[model samples]
Target: QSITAGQKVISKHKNGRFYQCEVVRLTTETFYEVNFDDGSFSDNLYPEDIVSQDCLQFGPPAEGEVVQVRWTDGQVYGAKFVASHPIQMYQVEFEDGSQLVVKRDDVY
Candidate 1:
Protein backbone atom coordinates (compact mmCIF):
# COMPACT_ATOMS: atom_id res chain seq x y z
CA GLN A 1 0.00 0.00 0.00
CA SER A 2 1.16 3.52 -0.77
CA ILE A 3 0.27 6.88 0.73
CA THR A 4 1.09 10.41 -0.24
CA ALA A 5 1.57 13.53 1.79
CA GLY A 6 -1.52 15.72 2.12
CA GLN A 7 -3.84 12.79 1.43
CA LYS A 8 -6.86 12.27 3.68
CA VAL A 9 -6.84 9.08 5.71
CA ILE A 10 -8.15 7.26 8.73
CA SER A 11 -5.87 5.82 11.40
CA LYS A 12 -6.81 3.40 14.11
CA HIS A 13 -5.98 4.50 17.61
CA LYS A 14 -4.07 2.46 20.16
CA ASN A 15 -7.31 1.54 21.89
CA GLY A 16 -8.90 0.10 18.75
CA ARG A 17 -10.57 3.32 17.65
CA PHE A 18 -10.44 5.29 14.41
CA TYR A 19 -10.12 8.94 13.55
CA GLN A 20 -9.97 10.98 10.37
CA CYS A 21 -6.67 12.58 9.53
CA GLU A 22 -4.59 14.11 6.81
CA VAL A 23 -1.33 12.55 5.88
CA VAL A 24 1.06 15.32 6.65
CA ARG A 25 4.28 13.69 5.61
CA LEU A 26 6.45 10.62 5.92
CA THR A 27 8.63 10.99 8.94
CA THR A 28 12.22 10.05 8.46
CA GLU A 29 12.16 8.96 12.06
CA THR A 30 9.75 6.00 12.30
CA PHE A 31 6.08 6.95 11.78
CA TYR A 32 3.98 8.78 9.23
CA GLU A 33 2.85 12.20 10.39
CA VAL A 34 -0.87 12.95 10.37
CA ASN A 35 -3.16 15.76 11.41
CA PHE A 36 -6.39 14.61 12.98
CA ASP A 37 -9.81 16.12 12.25
CA ASP A 38 -10.11 17.12 15.91
CA GLY A 39 -7.15 19.45 15.48
CA SER A 40 -4.74 16.95 16.99
CA PHE A 41 -1.61 15.51 15.44
CA SER A 42 -0.14 12.02 15.36
CA ASP A 43 3.61 11.93 14.98
CA ASN A 44 3.57 8.16 14.53
CA LEU A 45 1.26 6.19 12.27
CA TYR A 46 1.14 3.07 10.14
CA PRO A 47 0.37 3.69 6.49
CA GLU A 48 -1.22 0.31 5.83
CA ASP A 49 -3.53 0.88 8.80
CA ILE A 50 -5.39 3.55 6.94
CA VAL A 51 -9.04 2.74 6.43
CA SER A 52 -11.51 3.60 3.67
CA GLN A 53 -12.51 7.20 2.95
CA ASP A 54 -16.04 6.49 4.14
CA CYS A 55 -14.74 6.17 7.71
CA LEU A 56 -13.80 9.81 7.56
CA GLN A 57 -17.39 10.83 8.11
CA PHE A 58 -17.38 10.02 11.82
CA GLY A 59 -19.52 11.81 14.40
CA PRO A 60 -21.72 11.26 17.39
CA PRO A 61 -25.46 10.80 17.17
CA ALA A 62 -28.01 13.16 18.67
CA GLU A 63 -28.64 13.15 22.41
CA GLY A 64 -31.52 11.14 23.85
CA GLU A 65 -31.61 8.93 20.78
CA VAL A 66 -31.57 5.15 20.71
CA VAL A 67 -28.55 3.69 18.97
CA GLN A 68 -27.25 0.23 18.17
CA VAL A 69 -24.00 -0.69 19.87
CA ARG A 70 -21.69 -3.55 19.03
CA TRP A 71 -20.97 -4.93 22.49
CA THR A 72 -18.76 -7.75 21.36
CA ASP A 73 -18.47 -10.74 19.08
CA GLY A 74 -20.63 -8.91 16.48
CA GLN A 75 -23.55 -8.85 18.90
CA VAL A 76 -25.18 -5.46 18.58
CA TYR A 77 -27.60 -4.20 21.19
CA GLY A 78 -29.89 -1.22 21.60
CA ALA A 79 -28.50 1.61 23.65
CA LYS A 80 -30.02 4.97 24.42
CA PHE A 81 -27.88 8.02 24.19
CA VAL A 82 -27.45 9.82 27.48
CA ALA A 83 -24.80 12.48 26.93
CA SER A 84 -21.95 13.49 24.69
CA HIS A 85 -18.66 15.22 25.14
CA PRO A 86 -15.73 16.61 23.28
CA ILE A 87 -13.25 14.21 21.69
CA GLN A 88 -16.19 12.31 20.12
CA MET A 89 -17.18 10.40 23.27
CA TYR A 90 -20.73 9.41 24.11
CA GLN A 91 -22.51 8.23 27.26
CA VAL A 92 -25.09 5.58 26.61
CA GLU A 93 -27.40 3.45 28.74
CA PHE A 94 -27.61 -0.10 27.55
CA GLU A 95 -30.72 -2.26 27.42
CA ASP A 96 -29.20 -4.55 30.02
CA GLY A 97 -29.73 -1.88 32.65
CA SER A 98 -26.20 -0.58 32.55
CA GLN A 99 -24.27 2.34 31.17
CA LEU A 100 -21.53 2.14 28.64
CA VAL A 101 -19.21 4.93 27.60
CA VAL A 102 -18.08 4.60 24.05
CA LYS A 103 -16.66 6.60 21.23
CA ARG A 104 -18.84 8.05 18.50
CA ASP A 105 -17.26 5.97 15.77
CA ASP A 106 -17.85 2.79 17.78
CA VAL A 107 -21.62 3.14 17.67
CA TYR A 108 -23.73 2.63 14.57
Candidate 2:
Protein backbone atom coordinates (compact mmCIF):
# COMPACT_ATOMS: atom_id res chain seq x y z
CA GLN A 1 0.00 0.00 0.00
CA SER A 2 1.04 3.62 -0.49
CA ILE A 3 1.38 6.33 2.16
CA THR A 4 -1.78 7.89 3.61
CA ALA A 5 -2.75 11.54 4.02
CA GLY A 6 -2.07 11.42 7.76
CA GLN A 7 1.44 10.19 7.01
CA LYS A 8 2.53 12.88 4.63
CA VAL A 9 3.57 15.74 6.90
CA ILE A 10 7.14 15.74 8.30
CA SER A 11 9.71 18.05 9.95
CA LYS A 12 11.83 20.24 7.68
CA HIS A 13 13.94 23.34 8.35
CA LYS A 14 14.66 25.73 5.51
CA ASN A 15 17.77 27.94 5.38
CA GLY A 16 19.07 26.18 8.48
CA ARG A 17 16.35 27.22 10.88
CA PHE A 18 13.86 25.64 13.26
CA TYR A 19 11.61 22.95 11.89
CA GLN A 20 8.44 24.20 10.27
CA CYS A 21 5.26 22.56 8.98
CA GLU A 22 5.82 20.66 5.73
CA VAL A 23 3.32 20.40 2.92
CA VAL A 24 1.81 16.98 3.54
CA ARG A 25 -1.45 17.01 1.65
CA LEU A 26 -0.91 14.31 -0.96
CA THR A 27 -3.54 15.47 -3.37
CA THR A 28 -2.13 18.96 -3.64
CA GLU A 29 0.37 19.26 -6.46
CA THR A 30 1.95 22.49 -5.28
CA PHE A 31 4.40 20.96 -2.78
CA TYR A 32 6.16 17.65 -2.65
CA GLU A 33 4.88 15.09 -0.14
CA VAL A 34 7.27 14.06 2.65
CA ASN A 35 7.53 11.16 5.07
CA PHE A 36 6.25 11.37 8.66
CA ASP A 37 6.45 8.89 11.51
CA ASP A 38 3.21 8.37 13.39
CA GLY A 39 4.49 5.53 15.55
CA SER A 40 7.39 7.42 17.11
CA PHE A 41 6.39 11.01 16.41
CA SER A 42 7.60 13.81 18.75
CA ASP A 43 5.29 16.75 18.06
CA ASN A 44 1.91 15.86 19.48
CA LEU A 45 -0.75 16.70 16.96
CA TYR A 46 -4.39 17.55 16.54
CA PRO A 47 -5.70 19.61 13.57
CA GLU A 48 -5.13 23.13 14.86
CA ASP A 49 -1.34 23.28 14.73
CA ILE A 50 -0.12 26.13 12.55
CA VAL A 51 1.92 25.47 9.39
CA SER A 52 5.09 27.38 8.69
CA GLN A 53 5.98 28.79 5.28
CA ASP A 54 9.62 27.68 5.06
CA CYS A 55 10.69 24.03 5.25
CA LEU A 56 13.39 21.70 3.99
CA GLN A 57 12.89 20.14 0.62
CA PHE A 58 11.40 16.65 0.35
CA GLY A 59 14.54 14.68 1.11
CA PRO A 60 16.85 13.68 3.94
CA PRO A 61 19.97 15.49 5.09
CA ALA A 62 23.46 14.22 4.20
CA GLU A 63 25.21 11.39 5.98
CA GLY A 64 28.16 11.63 8.44
CA GLU A 65 26.82 15.03 9.38
CA VAL A 66 27.32 15.71 13.06
CA VAL A 67 25.14 18.74 13.58
CA GLN A 68 24.79 20.95 16.62
CA VAL A 69 21.33 22.45 16.80
CA ARG A 70 20.02 24.95 19.35
CA TRP A 71 16.30 24.72 19.97
CA THR A 72 14.09 27.79 20.09
CA ASP A 73 14.75 28.04 23.82
CA GLY A 74 18.50 28.31 23.20
CA GLN A 75 19.23 24.91 24.70
CA VAL A 76 21.44 22.67 22.59
CA TYR A 77 20.96 19.19 21.18
CA GLY A 78 23.43 17.34 18.99
CA ALA A 79 21.62 15.36 16.29
CA LYS A 80 21.58 14.16 12.71
CA PHE A 81 19.01 14.01 9.88
CA VAL A 82 19.93 11.16 7.57
CA ALA A 83 19.36 10.68 3.87
CA SER A 84 16.21 8.89 2.70
CA HIS A 85 13.20 9.31 0.48
CA PRO A 86 10.06 10.80 1.98
CA ILE A 87 8.04 8.18 3.79
CA GLN A 88 5.31 7.79 6.42
CA MET A 89 7.85 7.53 9.19
CA TYR A 90 10.87 9.34 10.69
CA GLN A 91 13.74 7.83 12.66
CA VAL A 92 15.99 10.51 14.23
CA GLU A 93 19.21 9.05 15.63
CA PHE A 94 21.07 10.68 18.46
CA GLU A 95 24.81 10.60 19.07
CA ASP A 96 24.39 7.33 20.94
CA GLY A 97 22.08 5.80 18.28
CA SER A 98 19.01 6.14 20.55
CA GLN A 99 16.13 7.82 18.77
CA LEU A 100 12.99 9.97 19.01
CA VAL A 101 10.42 10.38 16.27
CA VAL A 102 8.59 13.65 15.81
CA LYS A 103 5.42 14.31 13.87
CA ARG A 104 4.29 17.30 11.91
CA ASP A 105 3.28 20.17 14.15
CA ASP A 106 -0.03 20.59 12.33
CA VAL A 107 -1.01 17.10 13.32
CA TYR A 108 0.07 17.80 16.86
Candidate 3:
Protein backbone atom coordinates (compact mmCIF):
# COMPACT_ATOMS: atom_id res chain seq x y z
CA GLN A 1 0.00 0.00 0.00
CA SER A 2 1.71 3.16 -1.18
CA ILE A 3 0.57 6.62 -0.08
CA THR A 4 1.57 9.98 -1.49
CA ALA A 5 2.46 13.01 0.53
CA GLY A 6 -0.57 15.13 1.45
CA GLN A 7 -3.02 12.28 1.07
CA LYS A 8 -5.81 11.98 3.60
CA VAL A 9 -5.68 8.74 5.53
CA ILE A 10 -7.09 6.97 8.54
CA SER A 11 -4.32 6.08 10.97
CA LYS A 12 -4.13 4.12 14.15
CA HIS A 13 -3.28 6.40 17.03
CA LYS A 14 -0.95 5.51 19.89
CA ASN A 15 -4.06 5.19 22.02
CA GLY A 16 -5.20 2.28 19.79
CA ARG A 17 -8.02 4.21 18.11
CA PHE A 18 -8.13 5.39 14.51
CA TYR A 19 -8.15 9.08 13.55
CA GLN A 20 -8.01 11.24 10.47
CA CYS A 21 -4.47 12.01 9.35
CA GLU A 22 -2.65 13.44 6.40
CA VAL A 23 0.50 11.92 5.02
CA VAL A 24 3.29 14.42 5.52
CA ARG A 25 5.83 12.43 3.50
CA LEU A 26 7.50 9.13 3.15
CA THR A 27 9.93 8.62 6.01
CA THR A 28 11.19 5.24 4.89
CA GLU A 29 10.28 2.41 2.52
CA THR A 30 7.88 1.08 5.12
CA PHE A 31 7.25 4.13 7.28
CA TYR A 32 5.47 7.37 6.54
CA GLU A 33 5.17 10.63 8.40
CA VAL A 34 1.62 11.63 9.25
CA ASN A 35 -0.11 14.55 10.92
CA PHE A 36 -3.17 13.68 12.96
CA ASP A 37 -6.21 15.90 12.72
CA ASP A 38 -5.98 16.58 16.44
CA GLY A 39 -2.69 18.40 15.83
CA SER A 40 -0.38 15.52 16.64
CA PHE A 41 2.39 14.28 14.38
CA SER A 42 3.96 10.85 14.00
CA ASP A 43 7.05 10.00 11.97
CA ASN A 44 7.38 6.33 12.79
CA LEU A 45 4.25 4.91 11.22
CA TYR A 46 4.09 1.64 9.33
CA PRO A 47 1.80 0.94 6.38
CA GLU A 48 -0.26 -1.38 8.54
CA ASP A 49 -1.11 1.54 10.76
CA ILE A 50 -3.00 3.31 7.95
CA VAL A 51 -5.98 2.73 5.74
CA SER A 52 -7.47 4.66 2.85
CA GLN A 53 -10.01 7.29 3.80
CA ASP A 54 -12.78 5.58 1.83
CA CYS A 55 -12.10 2.42 3.76
CA LEU A 56 -13.92 4.00 6.67
CA GLN A 57 -17.05 2.01 7.37
CA PHE A 58 -19.31 4.78 8.61
CA GLY A 59 -20.95 7.70 6.88
CA PRO A 60 -21.28 11.28 8.07
CA PRO A 61 -23.92 11.98 10.66
CA ALA A 62 -27.13 13.76 9.84
CA GLU A 63 -27.94 17.07 11.44
CA GLY A 64 -29.24 16.69 14.96
CA GLU A 65 -28.10 13.09 15.12
CA VAL A 66 -26.55 11.94 18.36
CA VAL A 67 -22.98 10.78 18.00
CA GLN A 68 -19.76 10.17 19.80
CA VAL A 69 -16.77 12.48 19.41
CA ARG A 70 -13.14 11.72 20.00
CA TRP A 71 -11.51 14.57 21.87
CA THR A 72 -7.85 15.58 21.95
CA ASP A 73 -7.40 13.75 25.21
CA GLY A 74 -8.36 10.54 23.34
CA GLN A 75 -11.62 10.22 25.16
CA VAL A 76 -14.94 9.64 23.39
CA TYR A 77 -18.03 11.65 24.38
CA GLY A 78 -21.59 11.89 23.27
CA ALA A 79 -22.50 14.82 21.09
CA LYS A 80 -25.17 16.01 18.69
CA PHE A 81 -24.47 16.91 15.11
CA VAL A 82 -24.85 20.61 14.50
CA ALA A 83 -23.46 21.28 11.06
CA SER A 84 -20.85 20.38 8.48
CA HIS A 85 -17.90 22.48 7.61
CA PRO A 86 -16.33 22.95 4.18
CA ILE A 87 -13.29 20.85 4.84
CA GLN A 88 -14.87 17.57 5.88
CA MET A 89 -15.18 18.66 9.48
CA TYR A 90 -18.38 18.58 11.48
CA GLN A 91 -19.70 20.86 14.18
CA VAL A 92 -21.16 19.10 17.18
CA GLU A 93 -22.71 20.15 20.45
CA PHE A 94 -21.89 18.32 23.64
CA GLU A 95 -24.15 17.75 26.60
CA ASP A 96 -22.86 20.86 28.27
CA GLY A 97 -24.03 23.01 25.31
CA SER A 98 -20.45 23.34 24.18
CA GLN A 99 -19.75 23.06 20.48
CA LEU A 100 -16.66 21.77 18.69
CA VAL A 101 -15.48 21.18 15.18
CA VAL A 102 -14.12 17.71 14.64
CA LYS A 103 -12.67 15.79 11.75
CA ARG A 104 -14.82 13.21 10.00
CA ASP A 105 -13.07 10.23 11.46
CA ASP A 106 -13.19 11.69 14.95
CA VAL A 107 -16.95 11.25 15.08
CA TYR A 108 -18.82 8.02 15.42
Top lDDT prediction, candidate number: 3
By summed lDDT, the worst window of 10 consecutive residues in model 2 runs over: 41-50
Model 1 CA lDDT for position 66: 46
lDDT of 1 at 37: 39
What does candidate 1's lDDT look like per residue over 31-84, in tens digits?
A: 233333344444333222233212124433454444444332555445444333
Which is the winner by lDDT between candidate 1 and candidate 2? 1
Question: Candidate 2's residue-wise lDDT over 1-108, tens digit each?
Answer: 343443433343323333424333443112222223232222222111112212244322345343343344555445443333333444332333333343334232
What tens-digit string does per-residue lDDT give for candidate 3 at 1-108? 444555666654445555665544443232334444454544443333333321124433455554444444655545444443224343444433444434445544
The alpha-carbon deviation from the true structure for residue 14 of candidate 2, after best TM-score superposition, in angstroms, is 23
lDDT of 2 at 39: 25
Query: At residue 78, what lDDT does model 2 achieve?
Result: 50
Instruction: Specify the highest-TM-score model's number.
Output: 3
TM-score of each: 0.27, 0.24, 0.29
TM-score of 2: 0.24
Question: Which runs of model 3 end up more than 4 angstroms from their true locations?
Answer: 1-58, 88-108
